[PDB]
Amino acid sequence: ERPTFYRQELNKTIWEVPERYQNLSPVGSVCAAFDTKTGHRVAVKKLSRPFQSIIHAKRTYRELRLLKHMKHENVIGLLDVFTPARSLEEFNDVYLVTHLMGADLNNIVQKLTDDHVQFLIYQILRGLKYIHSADIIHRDLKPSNLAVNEDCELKILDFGLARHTDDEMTGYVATRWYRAPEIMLNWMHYNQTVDIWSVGCIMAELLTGRTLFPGTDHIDQLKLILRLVGTPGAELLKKISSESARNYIQSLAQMPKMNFANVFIGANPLAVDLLEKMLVLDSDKRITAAQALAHAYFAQYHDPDDEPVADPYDQSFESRDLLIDEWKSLTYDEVISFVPPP
Ligand SMILES: OCc1ccc(-n2cnc3ccccc32)cc1
Ligand SMILES: [Cl-]
Numbered sequence: 001e002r003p004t005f006y007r008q009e010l011n012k013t014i015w016e017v018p019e020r021y022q023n024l025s026p027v028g029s030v031c032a033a034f035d036t037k038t039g040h041r042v043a044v045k046k047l048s049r050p051f052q053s054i055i056h057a058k059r060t061y062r063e064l065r066l067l068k069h070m071k072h073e074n075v076i077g078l079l080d081v082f083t084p085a086r087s088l089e090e091f092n093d094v095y096l097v098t099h100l101m102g103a104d105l106n107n108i109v110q111k112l113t114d115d116h117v118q119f120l121i122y123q124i125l126r127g128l129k130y131i132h133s134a135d136i137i138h139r140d141l142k143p144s145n146l147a148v149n150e151d152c153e154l155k156i157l158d159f160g161l162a163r164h165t166d167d168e169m170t171g172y173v174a175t176r177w178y179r180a181p182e183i184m185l186n187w188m189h190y191n192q193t194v195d196i197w198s199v200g201c202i203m204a205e206l207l208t209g210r211t212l213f214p215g216t217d218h219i220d221q222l223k224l225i226l227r228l229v230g231t232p233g234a235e236l237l238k239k240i241s242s243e244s245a246r247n248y249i250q251s252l253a254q255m256p257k258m259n260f261a262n263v264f265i266g267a268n269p270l271a272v273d274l275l276e277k278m279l280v281l282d283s284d285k286r287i288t289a290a291q292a293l294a295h296a297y298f299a300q301y302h303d304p305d306d307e308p309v310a311d312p313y314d315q316s317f318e319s320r321d322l323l324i325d326e327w328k329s330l331t332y333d334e335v336i337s338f339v340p341p342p
């Protein structure tokens with residue numbers, strides 16, 4: 001049976017939601033609320049103009065499909081999705097409900113012990129093993145996209161939905177400091193290995209308290225990266241598809257890889273070893289999430305019987321060309337078929 005909905009205007013917005021959600025307060029637009037069915041405090045997000053163009057309609061479908069699939073302790077999941085519409089013909093608004101997140105990793109990064117770093121990076125890799133097993137690439141791992149609570153428990157959120165723009169990646173900005181070099185400069189078709197580069201940048205910052213590669217622009221950032229890991233050899237150069245980018249790289253004086261024990265002074269030698277295996281220029285040769293979970297740095301948390309993988313995830317829609325109203329009808333079907341978690 002359809003729940004009873006009620007309406008209210010919150011900061012120049014009309015919100016129409018089921019009675020179970022109470023005490024809404026602004027925090028798409030997002031409100032915090034109390035969910036009387038589950039007892040949790042929740043975030044309710046009303047999508048802005050979800051079907052205004054073909055690109056926007058497909059992006060709405062993409063986000064709903066991804067959030068419906070993610071069922072893992074270290075990844076954001078969907079508690080509910082609803083529309084006040086009674087039929088496809090009046091369908092216009094989409095609302096998403098998740099657990100309410102408080103601090104991100106920035107709000108926590110306090111004095112962190114090596115034990116804190118072990119536990120935080122372990123949880124990121126445990127969630128990434130799950131995400132990657134479904135052939136999903138996050139693409140935007142950075143401290144503001146990692147929620148952390150008082151007990152140091154962590155969830156990954158804000159998957160890259162192919163959103164970030166040119167102006168957003170320009171200059172002295174944290175939105176670019178965690179990106180792998182091959183995707184920052186469009187060197188090649190990238191894959192899930194780009195996320196492991198991001199984890200290395202995050203781990204380094206937890207150990208030192210400082211951004212690893214705070215470039216003032218794309219080129220300054222590339223120079224910081226190559227000073228640490230060395231300039232590429234002929235093997236990697238072959239894999240860069242742009243003749244232009246290859247010529248630029250060969251314009252630079254050659255540099256050897258630095259000694260990471262003299263960069264991360266005083267760190268656990270096992271942490272230094274893991275960083276050397278994540279921060280490898282050739283993406284083919286980086287450690288994977290599944291391999292990293294078995295590294296000795298995580299010996300006190302690793303449990304191979306409690307590091308689950310995902311159900312298969314069908315992304316064939318990504319190569320499909322549809323009209324606005326066909327993307328809209330697919331989205332409607334996914335809203336009405338939602339089954340809540342236990
Ligand atoms: O777009 C999906 C989605 C992403 C993030 C969240 N979210 C959870 N807790 C929050 C607190 C503040 C702002 C957003 C929040 C909800 C939904
Ligand atoms: Cl209700």
Ligand SMILES: [Cl-]
Nearest residue numbers: 085091092093
């Ligand atoms: Cl509606």
Ligand SMILES: [Cl-]
Nearest residue numbers: 134135312313
């Ligand atoms: Cl898959």
Ligand SMILES: [Cl-]
Nearest residue numbers: 142143144174
């Ligand atoms: Cl950030």
Ligand SMILES: [Cl-]
Nearest residue numbers: 252253254255
């Ligand atoms: Cl040289």
Ligand SMILES: [Cl-]
Nearest residue numbers: 312313314315
């Ligand atoms: Cl699927």
Ligand SMILES: [Mg+2]
Nearest residue numbers: 144145157158
């Ligand atoms: Mg974010």
